[PDB]
Nucleic acid binder design. Structure first.
Ligand SMILES: [Mg+2]
Ligand SMILES: [Mg+2]
Ligand SMILES: [Mg+2]
Lengths: 113, 99, 102, 56, 33, 100
RNA sequence: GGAACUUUACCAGAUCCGGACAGGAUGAGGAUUGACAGAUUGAGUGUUCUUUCUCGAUUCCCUGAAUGGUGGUGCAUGGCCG
């Protein structure tokens, strides 16, 4: 049902780094290009550990982070990330519809009037 | 870091005794360079500031400040303390005192 | 022969004119061909700041100006002769630069 | 790892926070023209010595 | 109010001697490198 | 027990003196040391044995000292109030890299 | 005073000492400094911890002090400005 740029989840996971960079929009691709030589955040491997520790049938434990400018990759789908909004960590589930967006687009820092 | 390694303190004291004054820009981030018998040596400005703060509290140097720069000058008791610290000869004299 | 250019610049008009006149006289004593002096365009450095510290009251401004005068003289003389001509007590605040033209 | 973290953002040396008045080390109302790097209040205090004058 | 417990003052584990632990004693060698 | 009282003091200048078991052993294993001085009343057989053996492997000299307290007072490991008898920090080993 | 970070003075957290000096305690048989790996954590941040190293009398603890502060008071002032 869910597709990103016409690709379902499994071929999206099969996609490599260069293909995903070419498949993503301009700001995300620029972010990936400028972070190419920089070491990736430890949050990625923390999420990988959390994903590999959960049994099939229930949700992986949430990982808390201050980072907001991380591009959501297809492998991050299914992980639970608690993003800091300034004074609390707000747990969100990474869905396929979130691919290509930043983490900071899902933790609202302010409250509406 | 204000942890001053002993050789850095010895070099600073030797330059302070040779050239009777020391001028250092007041920036937490930065390096101070001095000349001892040719060549150079570099110690962080924070460590020079710490050493001169200790010397000032012990009434051994006179201090002046203008336009982000310190100016420390060894007085008579400071000169005697420097001479005893580096075990220089009693005839050892700063450049500003040598004719 | 070869041309030597003296560039005389200063922020004091009287000092720059005095140095230029002295160089002119010294060169005339040496019987050398002279081009100039050329009075180059005067440049004005402008800094316009608010007069008040803080930000209270009518927004009044200060206009600080600094004017720079430059002169150039060309001497058809060897480098030794030009060095002789410029060897005198120069007025303070006057910068004299020597350049060989092609 | 605190020695690496200490003043790591000031290491970059970009923005208003990396430049201060060469007289008073204040980071507000700096004058960058002609690479003066003097705050406007200190500039008003020192302009005559620097060489500027109040005309017009 | 502090929800977390206070981080304790850092003490260094000091063992006496500690310079003879490296040397196995004669024909003396170093335990590692 | 007389001339070493001048040798150690002269070597104090230019940071030629090295004190403590760990630092003296670090000198002895990695050379760059001219001699070491050991006070016999070190209270540890392993201490004196290793200190002698490290010099022996490197063929470094060794001078015995009858009193640990006197040697400690020599190198300057003493707390003053001129109360040098108030407290003397134990110093069983002294190694010299630069003679002066 | 067109503030993404810095600036920044505010909020939620986490560090460092940038507490000089003096008098006491410990202390080369080591005062202390800095860290690999695992975990604590927002942090492949020795922040703290386990377990191992490394420096070296520079430092730590503890009392008086001291210092810094875009802390207060512009109705205590200077200078400047309106
Ligand atoms: Mg901030
Ligand atoms: Mg008033
Ligand atoms: Mg007033």
């Amino acid at each position: 049902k869910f597709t990103y740029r016409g690709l379902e989840i499994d071929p999206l996971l099969a996609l490599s780094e260069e293909e995903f960079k070419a498949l993503v929009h301009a700001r995300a691709r620029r972010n990936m290009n400028r972070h190419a030589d920089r070491r990736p955040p430890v949050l990625l491997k923390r999420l990988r550990e959390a994903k590999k520790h959960v049994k099939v049938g229930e949700k992986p434990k949430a990982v808390k982070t201050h980072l907001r400018d991380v591009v959501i990759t297809p492998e991050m789908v299914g992980s639970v990330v608690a993003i800091y909004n300034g004074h609390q960590f707000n747990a969100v589930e990474i869905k396929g519809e979130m691919i290509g967006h930043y983490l900071g687009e899902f933790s609202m820092s302010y409250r509406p009037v | 870091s204000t942890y001053v390694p002993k050789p850095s303190r010895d070099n600073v004291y030797r330059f302070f005794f040779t050239e009777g004054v020391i001028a250092c820009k007041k920036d937490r981030m930065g390096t101070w360079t001095g000349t001892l018998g040719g060549n150079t040596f570099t110690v962080p400005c924070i460590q020079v500031m710490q050493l001169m703060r200790s010397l000032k509290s012990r009434n051994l140097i006179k201090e002046q400040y203008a336009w982000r720069h310190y100016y420390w000058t060894l007085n008579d008791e400071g000169i005697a303390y420097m001479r005893s610290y580096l075990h220089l000869a009693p005839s050892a004299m700063p450049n500003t005192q040598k004719p | 022969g070869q041309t030597v250019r003296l560039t005389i610049t200063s922020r004091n008009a009287k000092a720059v004119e005095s140095v230029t006149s002295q160089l002119l006289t010294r060169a005339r004593d040496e019987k050398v061909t002279i081009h100039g002096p050329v009075r180059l365009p005067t440049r004005t450095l402008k800094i316009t700041t608010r007069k008040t510290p803080c930000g209270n009251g009518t927004n009044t401004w200060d206009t600080f100006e600094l004017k720079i005068y430059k002169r150039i003289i060309d001497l058809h003389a060897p480098t030794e002769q030009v060095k002789k001509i410029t060897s005198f007590t120069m007025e303070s605040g006057v910068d004299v630069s020597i350049t060989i033209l092609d | 790892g605190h020695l690496d973290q200490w003043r790591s953002r000031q290491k970059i040396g970009m923005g208003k926070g990396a430049r201060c008045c060469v007289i008073c080390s204040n980071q507000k109302a700096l004058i960058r023209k002609y690479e003066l790097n003097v705050c406007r209040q200190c500039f008003r205090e020192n302009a005559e010595h620097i060489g500027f004058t109040k005309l017009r | 109010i502090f929800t977390k417990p206070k981080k304790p003052t850092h003490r260094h584990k000091l063992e006496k001697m500690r310079a003879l632990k490296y040397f196995k004693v004669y024909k003396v060698e170093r335990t590692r490198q | 027990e007389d001339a070493v009282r001048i040798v150690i003091q002269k070597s104090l200048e230019a940071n030629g003196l090295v004190r403590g078991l760990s630092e003296v052993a670090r000198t002895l294993d990695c050379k760059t040391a001219h001699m070491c001085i050991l006070a016999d009343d070190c209270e540890d057989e392993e201490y004196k044995k290793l200190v002698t053996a490290l010099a022996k492997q490197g063929n470094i000299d060794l001078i015995n000292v009858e009193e640990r307290e006197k040697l400690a007072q020599w190198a300057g490991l003493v707390r003053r109030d001129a109360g040098e008898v108030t407290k003397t920090l134990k110093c069983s080993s002294v190694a010299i890299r630069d003679f002066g």
